[PDB]
Structure formats: structure tokens, C-alpha cells
Amino acid sequence: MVLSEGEWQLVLHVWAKVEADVAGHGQDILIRLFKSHPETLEKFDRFKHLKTEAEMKASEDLKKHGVTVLTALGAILKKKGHHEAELKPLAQSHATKHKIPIKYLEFISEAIIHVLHSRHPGNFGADAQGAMNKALELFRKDIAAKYKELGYQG
Numbered sequence: 091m092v093l094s095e096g097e098w099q100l101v102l103h104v105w106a107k108v109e110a111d112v113a114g115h116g117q118d119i120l121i122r123l124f125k126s127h128p129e130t131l132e133k134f135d136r137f138k139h140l141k142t143e144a145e146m147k148a149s150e151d152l153k154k155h156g157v158t159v160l161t162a163l164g165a166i167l168k169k170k171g172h173h174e175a176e177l178k179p180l181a182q183s184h185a186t187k188h189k190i191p192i193k194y195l196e197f198i199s200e201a202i203i204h205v206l207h208s209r210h211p212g213n214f215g216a217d218a219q220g221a222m223n224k225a226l227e228l229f230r231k232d233i234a235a236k237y238k239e240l241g242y243q244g
């Protein structure tokens with residue numbers, strides 16, 4: 091699939107607002123993911139112990155990881171489809187070391203969309219959400235193709 095420049099503009103415009111507070115958005119997204127789909131938390135031996143939303147919000151370690159996640163995603167989105175080089179090490183670590191199924195990438199995509207919708211209603215109307223969804227679908231499609239080459243695809 092290919093996004094139009096108009097679609098990338100909608101994605102990068104709302105992303106510019108996300109970058110004003112990377113740590114805060116990273117925290118919101120990861121917490122939303124763990125509350126909505128508790129099973130995903132089991133993949134993080136680093137955070138499995140967190141029992142409540144309050145503990146999650148208080149974790150400095152969780153906030154640091156959210157920044158790492160958003161920084162990696164932001165670098166990919168800014169390539170506007172030319173992300174082959176950036177995707178390789180991510181696909182390798184998530185397929186071979188972390189063992190993250192495609193299903194879980196769908197869950198975090200949903201979490202990202204929910205958070206942007208709540209925090210940026212004026213910059214995340216239907217058209218902007220559709221463009222972000224297309225961008226995340228492209229990301230997942232390419233990661234899935236990589237998983238298959240690496241011998242995981244699941």
C-alpha cells in the first residue's frame with residue numbers, strides 16, 4: 091500500500107503535537123494498551139509486576155520505555171514509507187527475542203489512535219484518523235512480511 095502526500099501531511103501534523111510531550115504520550119499509550127489488553131503486559135518481564143494503573147503511572151521505567159517506543163515510531167513515520175532500514179532491527183528483535191505476535195501490534199495501534207483522539211480532537215478528525223490508521227496498517231503489513239522472512243510470521 092501507498093499513502094498520498096496529503097495523508098502523510100495529516101499524520102505528520104498530529105505527530106508534531108505528540109512530539110511536544112513525548113514522555114506523556116508514551117505513558118498514556120502503554121497504560122491504555124495494558125489496561126485494554128492485560129495479556130500484553132505478560133510480554134514485559136520488566137513490567138509484569140505492575141498491578142494497578144497507579145503503579146504504572148508511577149513507574150519511571152515504564153515512562154522511559156514509552157519514550158523509546160515513540161521515538162522509534164516517530165523516526166519510521168518521518169520516512170514516509172521509505173522505512174526498510176529502520177524496520178529490520180525492530181522486526182528481528184520483536185520476532186526472535188521478544189516474540190510479539192502481529193495481533194499485539196494491532197492492539198498498540200488501537201491504543202495510539204485512542205490517545206491521539208482524546209488529546210488532539212482538533213487535529214485528529216475523521217480524515218486525520220484514517221490517514222494515521224493507513225500509516226499504522228502499512229507499518230504492520232511490512233513488519234509481518236519481515237516476520238515471515240525471519241521465520242516467525244505469527
Ligand code: HEM
Nearest residue numbers: 130133134136158159162163179180183188190194195198
Ligand atoms: C508501535 C510498535 C512498537 C515499537 C515501535 C516498539 C519499539 C521497541 C523498541 C525501540 C525497543 C528497544 C529495542 C529492541 O528491543 O528492539 C522495544 C523493546 C521491546 N518491545 Fe517493543 N515496540 C513496539 C511494540 C511492542 C509490543 C506491542 C510489545 C508487546 C506487547 C512489545 C514488546 C517489547 C519488549 C518485551 C521489549 C523489551 C523491553 C525491555 O525489557 O527492555 N513491543 N520495542
Ligand SMILES: [Xe]
Nearest residue numbers: 116119156159
Ligand atoms: Xe508507546
Ligand SMILES: [Xe]
Nearest residue numbers: 180181184233
Ligand atoms: Xe515492532
Ligand SMILES: [Xe]
Nearest residue numbers: 195199226229
Ligand atoms: Xe504498530
Ligand SMILES: [Xe]
Nearest residue numbers: 167225228229
Ligand atoms: Xe509506516
